[PDB]
Amino acid sequence: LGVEGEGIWLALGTIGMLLGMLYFIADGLDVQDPRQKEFYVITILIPAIAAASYLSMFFGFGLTEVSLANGRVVDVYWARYADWLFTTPLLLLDIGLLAGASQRDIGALVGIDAFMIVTGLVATLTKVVVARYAFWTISTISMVFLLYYLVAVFGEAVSDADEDTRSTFNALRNIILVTWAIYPVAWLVGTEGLALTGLYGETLLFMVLDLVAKVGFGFILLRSRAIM
Amino acid sequence: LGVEGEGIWLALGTIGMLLGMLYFIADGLDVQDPRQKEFYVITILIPAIAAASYLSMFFGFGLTEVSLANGRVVDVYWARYADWLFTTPLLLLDIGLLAGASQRDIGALVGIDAFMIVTGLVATLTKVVVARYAFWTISTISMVFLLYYLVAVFGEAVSDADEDTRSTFNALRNIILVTWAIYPVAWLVGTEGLALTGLYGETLLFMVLDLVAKVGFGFILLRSRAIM
Amino acid sequence: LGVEGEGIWLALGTIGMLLGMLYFIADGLDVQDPRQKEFYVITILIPAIAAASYLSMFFGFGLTEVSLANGRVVDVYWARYADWLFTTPLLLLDIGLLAGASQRDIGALVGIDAFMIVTGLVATLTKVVVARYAFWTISTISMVFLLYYLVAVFGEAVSDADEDTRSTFNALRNIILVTWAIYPVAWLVGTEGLALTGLYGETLLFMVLDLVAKVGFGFILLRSRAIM
């Protein structure tokens, strides 16, 4: 399946996201409180967008070959970034609403987040080899800023909440810190960067990361006493 | 005009949207009240977007040929999706503001609207025939959910309003329910789907739907006592 | 550097935007007040986006050739419109927050701004010569509306503010009025329109405009007592 077998991870990733989406829908069917319900909506939308993106990539939509100024040909699943552009701000909105961050503070992170994803998409699409790395570098710096602000700004915001809320915040923060930081490493080691692994390995890595960052995070959030 | 004469419905769509836009601007010239003014702004912007999109299609911009795995070649007016991505959230915002729905509830419907339009663009553009129908199904599913939440959520929001506001909401709701539901049928019967009608018929049908969903909706909204 | 030497202005643009971004970051390091902080975040994000767009153009990403019905071939840097789509709304948010405009008034200007940039992108990309000038005219009309509303609506909002705030507002308003108005003239004289100057000249003109409109504007804003 796919260019070199990687479609198996695309199909698994689809099924995982859909399953996580369905569990979330079934869990929130009787929810009445408007704020609790907002966490449901956001958290159901996240794996919906990712299931759809995964499925599109399984069918070949969202996949282009890029010939670098190298002559190197790279099979670029650009549908990922489409997914990330919407799902990463939604994840930040989720944890920001948990933390009790202001509209101003969530907007700030979201802006930096969008910058991170778009400068990533440039890195991935550009044919000029130094540009690929220059943009990966720009995007990674912006992630570092984002991750610092998440800990500093949202961590302040949550400091006055109850123990359950601070505890769930810390768990969700740590899922973000560990998993999001791997993404630039995965890009670097995969076929977009140094090609230490091929498309099959790279696809498997992002499948696992996306599943943790979306369904794993969602699980932890929606089961917390904090949101109830 | 166009690939097979369909440019005539593109010119008429352009002129219809423009005339609606002009009517609404001339009708709003003396408006002082901020809330009333916001309905004018939203409701002018909608046919402005659609006139600009129709005109772009009339000139051939936003038209691509797509060769399906079928061998079938489909003439895809993709600029319709660009238009819809922004006008369908704006329509929902308009009806939401009338209903007195919360920021949470409006945002929720916009989310799922975006999901419907984007998955509909994938359906239209993918070459894999099973994928085209798969995405059309996904999108239709999301449409049903949206229409349900419109009736239930926005309908509950409007239930404490005055009689004029309730009656206008029901009129506008019923315009959306009938008109919006026809769009997936139009895709299925038109050249992107089963090709029971060709490009000229399909273009005629979207022109009529669009004029009703935007200018007809706008007319009913802006002439109501509810917004005054 | 570039197709016809214009790389020099792409590089210089990158550097000036980056330096403006670093001066603003340095300047806001001790800032504690939330509303003052917000002005820093928006004003640092603007030249960040613009520096990245310039660097992308310097490396040739965001450059297509368009063959017009004319036989004319035009080297179109489309990465500019990506940049503008985000930076012009942010510029409007920055001045609306200074003016104390409502969320409804800011959103209204952003909507017509988006319309202006997107119709300009169509003008730039369309192969049909009459459509180029039709969209340029659409876009310019929308710009005039936007500039009038900026004067009238934000001007009214700021009229109850302190004298420092009114004075800064008038400064920033006058930068937008003068500099923004030049953009459509620059499009018309340059390679996209009448070709009175070539790509090199056009790229120089946009570089100066962008620098004034972003770093010059930010400088005036961030140094004002009005935000302190």
Residue numbers in the entry:
A (entry chain A), B (entry chain B), C (entry chain C): 11 to 238
What's the publication's text?
The light-driven proton pumps feature a seven-transmembrane α-helical region with a lysine-bound retinal that serves as a chromophore responsive to light. In this study, wild-type crystal structure of a BR with optical stability under wide pH range from a square halophilic archaeon, Haloquadratum walsbyi (HwBR), was solved in two crystal forms. HwBR could not be classified into any existing subgroup of archaeal BR proteins based on the protein sequence phylogenetic tree, and it showed unique absorption spectral stability when exposed to low pH values. In summary, we characterized the overall important structural and photochemical features in HwBR and in comparison with other known BRs. This study demonstrated how the Arg82–Thr201 hydrogen-bonding network cap gives HwBR a stable optical property in a wide pH range.
In this work, HwBR proteins were crystallized using the in meso method, and the proteins packed into parallel trimeric and antiparallel dimeric crystals diffracted to 1.85 and 2.58 Å, respectively. The structures of the monomers were almost identical and consisted of seven transmembrane α-helices, two β-strands in the BC loops, and a prosthetic group all-trans retinal bound to Lys224 via a Schiff base. The values of root mean square deviation (r.m.s.d.) between monomers of the antiparallel dimer and of the trimer are ∼0.36 Å. The trimeric structure showed that lipids (1-monooleoyl-rac-glycerol, MPG) surrounded each monomer to induce the formation of a self-assembled trimeric structure. We used 30% glycerol as the cryoprotectant when harvesting the crystals. The presence of glycerol improved the resolution from 4 to 1.85 Å. In the structure, one glycerol molecule was found to be bound with chain B. In both structures of HwBR solved in this study, two guanidinium nitrogen atoms of Arg82 located at the BC loop formed hydrogen bonds with the carboxyl group of the main chain of Thr201 in the FG loop in the extracellular region. The location of the Arg82–Thr201 hydrogen-bonding network might shield the retinal-binding pocket from the outside proton equilibrium and protect the protonation condition of both the interior channel and the retinal-binding pocket.
